[PDB]
């Protein structure tokens, strides 16, 4: 007739909930997951008596508070989406080629392969949000389900749907921090207004959207000041463990008979106004990681998006 279940949102704090077999779980309690499966629209049975359930909505005050500490400030639909994505992507697999892990193509997840494989190369990074860092450590251990589902949830991605790698990558990196020092200083100057330095530190100093080469990043810009006069800007200091430059897909020929400086890059195949395909690549020859498919080429005609450079140690006298 009646059962009792343990309800949690963190797997550490549990509360007893009394239920009958008259109405559905959703009707009596809310959206609930049982061993990963959403059973909200089912009738409670004796087989689930005493078992633990993960609640996704209609949270108590205590559960809501613990939720915010565990996942950060998230929308009311986040928990459900995360739990749902976790169930959806359980069947996804990693391909391991010479110890290198790459997400196998499935349900339009190639953009995720590019994001994850790029993240795997970024040293000294960590996440402030406990659940994200926990899932991150699990990912580096060989179990990536939590991490994949989490970043999909934070990135508002939908299972099966195509998406943007760069967008997700920078969204994820915006939630991370560096375990070491990094510094980026822009110098702006104008004859009337004066000299102004713009300082960035930590992870923020290791990422830039709008440029894809070190040369273009260090180039001097010239524009109009607020006062209406000639204003300039130039990078005068850059000290990082690594450098991630991201921009629109631009076509070029990448060759190793030139000895490039960058370590890795992502590529968008197809036209930009339709559904395309992402491929991750590293230089060790160009090692191409096409969602589990690995190959090597000397050169490659491709549309590069994100580019990963080694540690920066740069200063300019600016003159």
């Amino acid at each position: 007739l009646t059962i009792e279940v343990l309800v949690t949102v963190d797997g550490v704090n549990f509360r007893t909930v009394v239920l009958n077999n008259k109405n559905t779980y959703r009707s009596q309690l809310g959206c609930v997951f049982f061993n990963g499966a959403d059973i909200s629209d089912t009738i409670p049975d004796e087989k689930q008596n005493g078992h633990s359930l993960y609640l996704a909505d209609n949270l108590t005050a205590d559960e809501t508070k613990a939720l915010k500490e565990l996942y950060g400030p998230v929308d009311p639909t986040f928990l459900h989406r995360f739990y749902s994505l976790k169930a959806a992507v359980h069947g996804w697999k990693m391909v391991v080629c010479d110890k290198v892990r790459s997400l196998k193509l499935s349900d339009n997840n190639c953009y995720l392969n590019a994001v994850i494989m790029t993240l795997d190369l970024l040293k000294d990074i960590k996440f402030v949000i406990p659940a994200l860092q926990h899932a991150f450590m699990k990912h580096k251990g060989g179990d990536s389900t939590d991490f994949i589902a989490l970043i999909m949830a934070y990135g508002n991605c939908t299972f099966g749907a195509p998406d943007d790698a760069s967008r997700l990558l920078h969204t994820v990196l915006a939630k991370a921090e560096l375990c070491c020092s990094a510094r980026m200083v822009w110098r702006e100057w104008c004859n009337v207004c004066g000299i102004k330095d713009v300082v960035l530190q930590g992870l923020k100093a290791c990422c830039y959207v709008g440029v894809q080469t070190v040369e273009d990043l260090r180039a001097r810009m010239t524009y109009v000041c607020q006062c209406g006069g000639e204003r300039h800007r130039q990078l005068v200091e850059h000290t990082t463990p690594w450098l991630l430059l991201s921009g629109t897909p631009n076509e070029k020929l990448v060759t190793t008979s030139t000895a490039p400086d960058f370590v890795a890059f992502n590529v968008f195949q197809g036209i930009e106004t339709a559904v395309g395909h992402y491929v991750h690549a590293r230089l060790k020859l160009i090692l191409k990681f096409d969602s589990g498919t690995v190959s090597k080429t000397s050169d490659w005609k491709c549309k590069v998006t994100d580019v990963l450079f080694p540690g920066q140690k740069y200063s300019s006298d600016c003159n």
Binding site: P73, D163, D164, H170, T171, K204, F268, H277
Partner: protein, 75 residues
Amino acid sequence: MQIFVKTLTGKTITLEVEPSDTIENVKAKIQDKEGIPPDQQRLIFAGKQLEDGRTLSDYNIQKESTLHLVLRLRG
């Protein structure tokens, strides 16, 4: 306060907002000026992608600031 948003084609629109407005609301202003859904908009300022969880003040964006609008790719 007026700001500037540049596209890939070339046309540059002007938006009248406030420091209190978040990126989620700024995308709503672009929605009523270009018709582009907020779900498919990427705003880039000072080399940084703008996240919906923060406002304009968090990125030190103010008067005569130029934003870059890039469409959300589908890979």
